[PDB]
Write an enzyme that holds these catalytic residues in place. Structure first.
Site, PDB file in Angstrom:
ATOM      1  N   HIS A  65      26.985  43.489  47.735  1.00  0.00           N
ATOM      2  CA  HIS A  65      28.396  43.268  47.981  1.00  0.00           C
ATOM      3  C   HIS A  65      28.583  42.474  49.270  1.00  0.00           C
ATOM      4  CE1 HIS A  65      30.173  45.753  44.803  1.00  0.00           C
ATOM      5  NE2 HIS A  65      29.234  46.647  45.040  1.00  0.00           N
ATOM      6  N   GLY A  66      29.736  41.827  49.371  1.00  0.00           N
ATOM      7  CA  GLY A  66      30.047  41.123  50.601  1.00  0.00           C
ATOM      8  C   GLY A  66      31.504  40.735  50.675  1.00  0.00           C
ATOM      9  N   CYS A 117      29.947  38.618  47.169  1.00  0.00           N
ATOM     10  CA  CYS A 117      31.309  38.111  47.219  1.00  0.00           C
ATOM     11  C   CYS A 117      31.647  37.599  48.619  1.00  0.00           C
ATOM     12  CB  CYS A 117      32.300  39.184  46.786  1.00  0.00           C
ATOM     13  SG  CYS A 117      32.213  39.475  45.015  1.00  0.00           S
ATOM     14  N   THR A 176      30.756  49.880  44.234  1.00  0.00           N
ATOM     15  CA  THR A 176      30.170  50.084  42.915  1.00  0.00           C
ATOM     16  C   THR A 176      28.702  49.683  42.879  1.00  0.00           C
ATOM     17  OG1 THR A 176      30.728  47.853  42.189  1.00  0.00           O
ATOM     18  CG2 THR A 176      32.357  49.582  41.807  1.00  0.00           C
ATOM     19  N   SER A 177      27.975  50.256  41.922  1.00  0.00           N
ATOM     20  CA  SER A 177      26.582  49.887  41.723  1.00  0.00           C
ATOM     21  C   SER A 177      26.480  48.528  41.039  1.00  0.00           C
ATOM     22  CB  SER A 177      25.863  50.951  40.901  1.00  0.00           C
ATOM     23  OG  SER A 177      25.788  52.161  41.629  1.00  0.00           O
TER      24      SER A 177
END
Ligand SMILES: [Cl-]
Ligand SMILES: [Cl-]
Lengths: 4, 241, 241, 4
Positions: free
Chosen positions: B93-94, B135, B34-35
Site C-alpha cells: 500500500h502507499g 498507490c 487490506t491484504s
C-alpha cells in the site's frame, strides 16, 4: 481487480 | 587504444548487484489496510526476472516500517564496490511519497536517502533503481476511447502509476505494472536500453488493462505508469565481451 | 506490404506542432518575486532550437496567472489534427506543482489538464511535452566529489530540477537546464530518441555546472534534472522518407 | 547564479  | 565513448553505465563489474524485493501482503489489523492478494505472484515473477538478469535477489515478506528502515540502512552500508547497480522493489500500500510497512507508513525519501551519492559511496556514479508498486493517492483514470555530482543523481523511480492515482492489482494475475514490467524485461533486456523497456511497459499497461468492478466508481478504469529518471547515462542490462 | 512496427510516435504529420514558450521575467511588485535575469537568453535559445525542429513557435512574455490559464485553454481548443505533437515551455518562479504568473501562482495540473486525452481530442495519442524551468522547493544539492487509453498517457514533463529543489539560472548565460537542453537538441535531435537526449541533458547539468556564491548557504551547489515520462512510444524529432 |  483491486487498488493498492 | 581507439576512440572511446562513455554514454552508458559500466555494467560489467563482477556482479550486477542486489535486487531487494519487499513484498508486503498482510498488514496489522489495527492499520485497517487490506491484504494485497496477488502480490505473491508479483514477488515470484520479479525474483525469476531479476535472477535471469544475474542480480543477487533477496526477497523479504511482511516487514514493519521499522524493519524496512533497518533493512535499507543495512543494505546501504554494505560494500557495493564490485556491484554494477542496485535495485529495490517495493510492493505495498502507499500514497504520494509513502510506502506502507505492515504497521504504518515509511517516507520514500527516508529509504532512498540512504543511497544518496554522498551517503553510499560504493554506489556513487552507479544506477540506483527503485521500482514501486503502490498507490499514490485515490484518483482514478477514466480513460478515453481511441568534480562533484549531485547527491540525487543516478536514481530511477519506476512508478506503477501517475502521481496522485490509485494503482491496480489483480488478485489472480498480479499487478498490471509488475506483470508488464517482467514481461518486457524478459523480452527486451538483451535488446533495448532501459528507458525504452519502460516505455514499452507504459504502453502495455495503458493499452492492455482496464478494471472490471461491480462498483461503478471503480469500473472501467485505466492506468499509466510514470518513469521518474535522474539517470545520467543509458542503462543496458547486458554488456559487450 | 511487409512487416510493420509501431514502437515510435508518428511524427510525419504535415506539421510538427506548436511550441508555446511562456517567459516570465518581471513580476508584480506586490508578489515580492525577483526578476529572472537570464531568462531572455533561454527564451531566445528555445525559439531558435525549436524553429530548427520545425515547430510553430509562439513566445509569450510576462503573463499573469489569468493570462496563462486563458492561453493554455485557447491553445487546447485549437484543431491540432494536422500536428504531430505539442510542446509547452514554462520559464518562471515556482514551487512543487506550481508555476508563477506575474501576479500569482498557477497549478501545473490545471494547465496540463486542458491537454488530457479526453479533453483535447486532436492531441489524443500524440506526445505532449511540458518543459519546466522553475524552482520546485527550496532544497539545495550540495553534491559529492567523485479500446481506451489513460487520460494522463502521452505526457512528458522535462523538469529542470529534482522534486523539492531549487533550480539554478545564470543571469548572463541563462539557466543550466535550458542551456543544456538546447545544446543537446541541437547536437542530437537528428540522431537520438528523446529520452536519450534528455539523459545527456541530465549528465551535462550534473557534471558541468556548480553554483558560485558569496553566500555560503548557496555556494558550490549542484543540480540534477528530472525526466517524468508517461509516454507510450519512442519519440524521434525526425522521420524517415 | 540565482535560484528560480
Ligand atoms: Cl498473493
Ligand atoms: Cl534576461
Amino acid at each position: 481487480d483491486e487498488v493498492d | 587504444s581507439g576512440i572511446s565513448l562513455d554514454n552508458s553505465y559500466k555494467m560489467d563489474y563482477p556482479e550486477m548487484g542486489l535486487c531487494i524485493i519487499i513484498n508486503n501482503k498482510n498488514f496489522h489489523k489495527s492499520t485497517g489496510m487490506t491484504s494485497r492478494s496477488g502480490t505473491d505472484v508479483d514477488a515470484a515473477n520479479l525474483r525469476e526476472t531479476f535472477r535471469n538478469l544475474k542480480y543477487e535477489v533477496r526477497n523479504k515478506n511482511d516487514l514493519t516500517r521499522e524493519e524496512i528502515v533497518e533493512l535499507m540502512r543495512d543494505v546501504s552500508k554494505e560494500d557495493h564496490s564490485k556491484r554494477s547497480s542496485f535495485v529495490c522493489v517495493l510492493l505495498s500500500h502507499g500514497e504520494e511519497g509513502i510506502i506502507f510497512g505492515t504497521n504504518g507508513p515509511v517516507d520514500l525519501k527516508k529509504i532512498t536517502n540512504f543511497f544518496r551519492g554522498d551517503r553510499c559511496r560504493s554506489l556513487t556514479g552507479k544506477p540506483k533503481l527503485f521500482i514501486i508498486q503502490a498507490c499514490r493517492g485515490t484518483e482514478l483514470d477514466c480513460g478515453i476511447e481511441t568534480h562533484k555530482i549531485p547527491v540525487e543523481a543516478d536514481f530511477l523511480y519506476a512508478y506503477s502509476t501517475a502521481p496522485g492515482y490509485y494503482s491496480w492489482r489483480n488478485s489472480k494475475d498480479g499487478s498490471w505494472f509488475i506483470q508488464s514490467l517482467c514481461a518486457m524485461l524478459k523480452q527486451y533486456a538483451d535488446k533495448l536500453e532501459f528507458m525504452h523497456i519502460l516505455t514499452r511497459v507504459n504502453r502495455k499497461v495503458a493499452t492492455e488493462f482496464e478494471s472490471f468492478s461491480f462498483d461503478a466508481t471503480f469500473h472501467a478504469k485505466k492506468q499509466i505508469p510514470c518513469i521518474f529518471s535522474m539517470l545520467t547515462k543509458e542503462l543496458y542490462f547486458y554488456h559487450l565481451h
